[PDB]
C-alpha cells in the first residue's frame, strides 16, 4: 500500500553522464556509444548569449575546442555537428556502459525522471510532468544544463529531455534528444515567459483511481455527468477539457475499481465545486496532477482494496 512520486532507478543513466567544457563554460553531456550529446550553448560566452549565431559561433570551433571528461578519463573528440539545439560530439571511445535506449519526444501531461547532474556527476533523482505549457517544475542550479529526463521500460532507457534553462517564474525548459525545444522557447538570453498553464485533468482522474485502489471512497457520489457538462466545469476551474480518448485511456483503472469514468468525472466536478477542505486524498490536501494513468498502474496493486 502507499503512493509516492516515484522515479525510475537511475543507474543505467548514471553510467552515461560526462562533463563537457568549451572555453570557460562547463556543463553535462550524455555519452551513448561513441557520441556525446550536450546543449549547443556550451560554445557561447555571456555576451554571445544575448543574440548568438550558433552556425557562426560553431564554424569557429575545432574538435580540440571541446574537452569531454568521463570520470577521471579524458575523451578525445574526433568530430562534431549541430543538431537543432544540441551538439553531437564524436569521441574515440564507445561508452561500455551504454544501455539499450531510444530517443522519444514526450507529450504534455506525461511524466519522466530527471537525473540532476553537475560537472558530469549525478547528484539526485526526481520525477516531474511535462506541463501543458511545455515547462517542467524541476530543481536546477547553475551547471545543471545537459542533465537528462528519461523513462525506463524493461531494460530500455527512453531519453526524452535535456535541460537548458530557467524562466523568470522559476520553471524549467529544455529539448528532446534531437535538440528540439519543448514549447516556443529558444536558447538565448532574451525575454521569454512561460505561457499560461492548466491542470492535467487526465492525471487528476488517474490519481483519484489510485486513491480508490488503495482503499479510499469518500469523494465518490451517486451522480454521473456528460462529457460536455464536465467540460463546462473544467473550463471554469482551468482544467484541460476531457476528451473521449482520455475517457478511453482510463478504461483499465475504471474496470479494476468498478467506477465508470463519467462517474469519477462527476466526483471530480463535485470536488472542484465544493472543495475537500479538511479532508485529504492519498495524504494530499489538493488535487494532484503529476501522475499519469500509466504511473498509477505501475505503482498500484493490480488488486483493489474493496
Amino acid at each position: 500500500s502507499g503512493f509516492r512520486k516515484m522515479a525510475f532507478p537511475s543507474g543505467k543513466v548514471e553510467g552515461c553522464m560526462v562533463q563537457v567544457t568549451c572555453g570557460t563554460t562547463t556543463l553535462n553531456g550524455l555519452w551513448l556509444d561513441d557520441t556525446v550529446y550536450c546543449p549547443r550553448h556550451v560554445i557561447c560566452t555571456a555576451e554571445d548569449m544575448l543574440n548568438p549565431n550558433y552556425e557562426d559561433l560553431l564554424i569557429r570551433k575545432s574538435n580540440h575546442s571541446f574537452l569531454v571528461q568521463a570520470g577521471n578519463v579524458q575523451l578525445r573528440v574526433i568530430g562534431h555537428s549541430m543538431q537543432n539545439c544540441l551538439l553531437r560530439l564524436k569521441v574515440d571511445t564507445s561508452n561500455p556502459k551504454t544501455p539499450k535506449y531510444k530517443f522519444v519526444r514526450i507529450q504534455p501531461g506525461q511524466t519522466f525522471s530527471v537525473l540532476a547532474c553537475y560537472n558530469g556527476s549525478p547528484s539526485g533523482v526526481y520525477q516531474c510532468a511535462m506541463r501543458p505549457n511545455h515547462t517542467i517544475k524541476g530543481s536546477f542550479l547553475n551547471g545543471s544544463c545537459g542533465s537528462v529526463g528519461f523513462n525506463i521500460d524493461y531494460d530500455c532507457v527512453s531519453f526524452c529531455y535535456m535541460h537548458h534553462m530557467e524562466l523568470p517564474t522559476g520553471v524549467h525548459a529544455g529539448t528532446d534528444l534531437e535538440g528540439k525545444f519543448y514549447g516556443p522557447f529558444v536558447d538565448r538570453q532574451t525575454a521569454q515567459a512561460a505561457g499560461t498553464d492548466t491542470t492535467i485533468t487526465l492525471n487528476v482522474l488517474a490519481w483519484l483511481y489510485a486513491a480508490v485502489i488503495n482503499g479510499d471512497r469518500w469523494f465518490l457520489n451517486r451522480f454521473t455527468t456528460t462529457l460536455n457538462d464536465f467540460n463546462l466545469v473544467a473550463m471554469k476551474y482551468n482544467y484541460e477539457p476531457l476528451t473521449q480518448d482520455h475517457v478511453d485511456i482510463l478504461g483499465p483503472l475504471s474496470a479494476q475499481t468498478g467506477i465508470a469514468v463519467l462517474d469519477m468525472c462527476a466526483a471530480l466536478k463535485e470536488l472542484l465545486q465544493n472543495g475537500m477542505n479538511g479532508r485529504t486524498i492519498l495524504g494530499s490536501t489538493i488535487l494532484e496532477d503529476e501522475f499519469t494513468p500509466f504511473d498509477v498502474v505501475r505503482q498500484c496493486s493490480g488488486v483493489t482494496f474493496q
Binding site: 542550479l141 551547471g143 535541460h163 538570453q189
Partner: peptide, 4 residues
Amino acid sequence: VTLX
C-alpha cells in the same frame, strides 16, 4: 531567461 537564465541559461543553466
